[PDB]
Amino acid sequence: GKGKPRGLNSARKLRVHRRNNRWAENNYKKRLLGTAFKSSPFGGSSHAKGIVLEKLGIESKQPNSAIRKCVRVQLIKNGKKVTAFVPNDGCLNFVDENDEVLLAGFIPGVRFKVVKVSGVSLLALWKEKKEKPR
Amino acid sequence: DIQGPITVVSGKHRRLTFLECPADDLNAMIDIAKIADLVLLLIDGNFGFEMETMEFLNIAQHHGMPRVLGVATHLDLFKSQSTLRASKKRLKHRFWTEV
Amino acid sequence: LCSPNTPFCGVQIVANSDTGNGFRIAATGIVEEIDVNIEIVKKLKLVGF
């Protein structure tokens, strides 16, 4: 006696019991109700568009400092302001204010990095294989 | 004969103005680039890309990209279809880098 | 002067006679600030024995 029915004709209860208990899982609940993407940083998207508001570390005396590579960006989808990392100060250059930037998941609290500016990859500009259209 | 701007009726409610930029002048390539709503970029297919083609694109990229359409010309000069098709491929993909 | 964020490009030769074959676009940039004075300085070193 394991606290469960075992009769050969008790298939019904085992199913009904299983369906009820399956809702206990958070993973099962999120998958069925489609609320798993609330927790995602971009609300289910793989990348985030934004506007460059300011370059916080532009002044910072120390080259290639963690502050220098941070840029404040406002997400277009919701308008919430966040920070993004830039690969390096040279890449901090191609970014200028009011440019469109595509963001991707990555000083603590900065969880985003810039992968495109003005519709072109930052690495492409950094390797200098392309030129930013304005 | 065509000289200077030519305005033509193009639709029920749409009109176009054609301008043939002087090919030999850079100073021309700059100021047309600042006002051209559409660019018909002519490329010699047999010869391939040239300087003045590339420079104007760079002028456009810095002063605001307008609509750019690549037009390949002198394709009849090719003698084989294989090289014609293959040549078209590089010219397109290289055009896809700038635009 | 011009408003900030105005992009520009630079060329060294505009005459056909000196065209050569090299690329004629020399520099590209974005104007950052407008002012009526600047204080550019350079390193001057005095040497003694």
């Binding site: 390797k127 294989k129 | 010699d44 010869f47 391939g48 040239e50 300087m51 290289r94 | 065209t19 074959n21």
Partner: peptide, 25 residues
């Protein structure tokens, strides 16, 4: 009369680190 594009323009390899010949094969 025609100014053709040079090697740097055509390939657009850009800035890349030096890579040993052995990687080619």
């Amino acid at each position: 009369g025609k100014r053709a594009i040079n090697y740097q323009i055509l390939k657009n390899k850009g800035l890349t680190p030096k890579r040993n010949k052995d990687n080619r094969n």
